[PDB]
Amino acid sequence: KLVRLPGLIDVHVHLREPGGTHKEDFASGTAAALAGGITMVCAMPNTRPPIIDAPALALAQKLAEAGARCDFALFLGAASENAGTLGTVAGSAAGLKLYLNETFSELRLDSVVQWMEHFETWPSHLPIVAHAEQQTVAAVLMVAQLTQRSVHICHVARKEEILLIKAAKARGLPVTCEVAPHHLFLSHDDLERLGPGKGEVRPELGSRQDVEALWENMAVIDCFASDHAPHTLEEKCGSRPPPGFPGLETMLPLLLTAVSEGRLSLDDLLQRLHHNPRRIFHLPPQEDTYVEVDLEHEWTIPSHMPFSKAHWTPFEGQKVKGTVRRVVLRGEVAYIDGQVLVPPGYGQDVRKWPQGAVPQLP
């Protein structure tokens, strides 16, 4: 007996095209999404070239329309030079992404004044998301208040961060957040097995107390999002390991395992992988789109999942219960039992759909 889920949405993925296609491309990363029960992805802008201007966005749109197998929206990235220049193209993006800490990105921002300039110039009705760790969460919240608008915090990883966000929500402030599976299912206790190269990720793996705090504060977590961040094993284990884990293919199995154990409900999961992504990013419905899962199937995560070009996973050896059996996307069988059945280019840019524009006052 299979359970029918709606089309799940991952608001934080790295698909590496353009410029990093040995790590992943639209075709492989969206194959990984479908096999993970994800029918729509929002792709981050820290590509090569980075998606920080209209020409780069135009290139990325065509690459995605030609390669993606599931539907998508593309983020724009904030830079030290582009505030006030994105107004014509802003509504065509998923949102604007700010990189406020050190990670796998060249998109620095040297001053909180540059953050303020982005919050002041980006259209006020369109999403802003931030990589903002520890005190940076409080700092970007201050900027959001000074400019009288909302902010969404990416990959919340620490007790410190979730409690800060909790306090802000208690004061009625417009902040939402997401949490990635590795910050719920891995911790410092896994660093010995992973080793120092594989274990590199930003935000770093937290303590057991960090993990426990995120679970205890599930009500504060608006979304789950993988932060699928593929790099090859050679890169992860070489002389300058880049931070990040692949995660599209493992996210839903890990979370289904937790549902089966009573750690959260099926509804809690569907709020965080479907309804709340829709409402925070004003992402449209996908007609005739659903995911069939088998909640009884027990299996062990292998050394690499089938699709991501990362060809490794930090969750190797974990026992899970729940698997994706079938995905239907806009009336076509997209995935069955390990076979992707829609070609590169089947996926579409949801921001071009009439129902995918973010509503605004004239």
We find the least distance from the C-beta atom of residue 106 to its own copies, in angstroms, to be: 32
We find the least distance from the C-beta atom of residue 106 to ligand NCD, in angstroms, to be: 11
Query: Quick one: tokens of 125?
Result: 């009705």
Supply angle C-alpha 166, 169, 175, rounded to 5.
105
> Quick one: what does residue 201 bind among Zn ion, its own copies, ligand NCD, none, with the CB cut-off 5 to 8 Å set by partner type?
ligand NCD
By CB under 6 A, tell whether 243 contacts ligand NCD. Answer: yes
Class of residue 116 by CB neighbours under 10 A (exposed 0-12, middle 13-18, buried 19+): middle
Kindly tell me which residue out of 46, 47, 136, 276 binds its own copies, with binding defined by CB under 8 A.
Answer: 276
By CB under 6 A, tell whether 61 contacts ligand NCD. Answer: no
Cβ atoms of 183 and 256 closer than 8 Å: no
- What is the rounded distance in angstroms from the CA atom of residue 108 to the CA atom of residue 305? 32
- What is the rounded distance in angstroms from the CA atom of residue 44 to the CA atom of residue 362? 29
Tokens 């620095």: give the residue.
108
Region binding its own copies by CB under 8 A among candidate stretches 77-85, 196-204, 226-234, 260-268: 260-268
> Quick one: what does residue 188 bind among its own copies, ligand NCD, Zn ion, none, with the CB cut-off 5 to 8 Å set by partner type?
none
196 assigned to a ligand binding site = no
Region binding ligand NCD by CB under 6 A among candidate stretches 53-61, 156-164, 239-247, 251-259: 239-247
Name the catalytic one among 210, 227, 267, 337.
Answer: 227
The shares of helix, strand and coil residues in the chain, as percent rounded to the nearest 5, are 35, 20, 45
By CB under 6 A, tell whether 117 contacts ligand NCD. Answer: no
331: CB partners within 8 A, 6+ apart: 287, 288
Binding residues vs ligand NCD (CB under 6 A): 14, 46, 103-104, 131, 201-202, 227, 229, 242-244
Name the residues that contact Zn ion, by CB under 5 A. 12, 131, 154, 227, 282
Which residues are marked as active site?
227
